[PDB]
């Protein structure tokens, strides 16, 4: 859909849109330049983030968030929230007395950029820690991998 679905005007603060349309510029059509950045740590910025139109101030690639701290992974559980999803991380807790393990889990609400479109329940998402984005969100989805899919019957 269109990107202006809010009461305010959605735009990237870095890019100046009104670059003096004059005779030397053949208008139209001049595509609006996009702001993006590489986040380091080997993660590549997606092509949808490169040449999309979505405005997301919390997107790791086209927003004002810096990825620093812990890089971890999880499994997508629900996608019912706006621009954010909940993931489940499964781990084994060691109990010394019985020398055995205990199956535990925690649910984390992470922010999902619109640059990731083909996201389904069960996909493995690598997320990175950022500044607090909401009351319960402190992580951004940096990488998405399919769960034995890449094909639809």
């Amino acid at each position: 859909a269109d990107i202006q679905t809010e009461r305010a005007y959605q735009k990237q603060p870095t890019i100046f849109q009104n670059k003096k349309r004059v005779l030397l510029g053949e208008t139209g059509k001049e595509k609006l330049p996009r702001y993006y950045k590489n986040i380091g740590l080997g993660f590549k910025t997606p092509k949808e983030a490169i040449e999309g139109t979505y405005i997301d101030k919390k997107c790791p690639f086209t927003g004002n968030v810096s990825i620093r701290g812990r890089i971890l992974s999880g499994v997508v559980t629900k996608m019912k929230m706006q621009r954010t999803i909940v993931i489940r991380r499964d781990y084994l807790h060691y109990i010394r007395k019985y020398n055995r393990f205990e199956k535990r889990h925690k649910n984390m609400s992470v922010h999902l950029s619109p640059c990731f479109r083909d996201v389904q329940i069960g996909d493995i998402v690598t997320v990175g820690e950022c500044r607090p984005l909401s009351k319960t969100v402190r992580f951004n989805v940096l990488k998405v991998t399919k769960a034995a899919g890449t094909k639809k019957q």
Binding site: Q17, N18, L23
Partner: protein, 206 residues
């Protein structure tokens, strides 16, 4: 007093949290500045670390930048026309960070004539002759006229801004935060943002 703590909120699971200490000073809040439009009134408040904050209770002038022309002038704010957060703020004429306001176009007009030597906002002319007759001719030399007619070619202004200049008031978005810095700096709306906000105002009324 007004507290900005996180421990008065329910847990993510929905459980009720119990405070392990009473309210601390560093997690305080203060009443909203609620910047209106009027003769200048700014109250100094002491903040954490002994630093200073300016509550602009009333403001009438602000520094606004055209952007496309790179002309930044100190102009006068007339009124608030739209606010994305609350319509009550528009009705009460409250100046906040993102509300768009009507500002006087007089300094931008004057810079436009003094830099491009084109009429702007005028209807038929011959109304301010003891001043504009000097700026139309300037009886200048070949090199100065070469500079000026070199600058004439890119002297194109959007029809929306032209209509606003005819009305005598531009509409601009604030960028600073009154009640934190005590001033109302901002930038003149133009382009797709201007079209979006104009359509919003038209849908609101008319």
């Amino acid at each position: 007093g007004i507290s900005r703590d996180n421990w008065h909120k329910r847990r993510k699971t929905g459980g009720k949290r119990k405070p392990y200490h009473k309210k601390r000073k560093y997690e305080l809040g203060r009443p909203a500045a609620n910047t209106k439009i009027g003769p200048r009134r700014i109250h100094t408040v002491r903040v954490r670390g002994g630093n200073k904050k300016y509550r602009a209770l009333r403001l009438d002038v602000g520094n606004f930048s055209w952007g496309s022309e790179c002309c930044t002038r100190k102009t006068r704010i007339i009124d608030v026309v739209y606010n994305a957060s609350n319509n009550e703020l528009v009705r009460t004429k409250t100046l906040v960070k993102n509300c768009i306001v009507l500002i006087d176009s007089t300094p931008y007009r004057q810079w436009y004539e003094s830099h491009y030597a084109l009429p702007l906002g005028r209807k038929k002319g011959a109304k301010l002759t003891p001043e504009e007759e000097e700026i139309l001719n300037k009886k200048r030399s070949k090199k100065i006229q070469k500079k000026y007619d070199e600058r004439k070619k890119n002297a194109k202004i959007s029809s929306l801004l032209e209509e606003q200049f005819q009305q005598g008031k531009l509409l601009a978005c604030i960028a600073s935060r009154p009640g934190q810095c005590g001033r109302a700096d901002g930038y003149v709306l133009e382009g797709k943002e201007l079209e979006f906000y104009l359509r919003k105002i038209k849908a609101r009324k008319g």
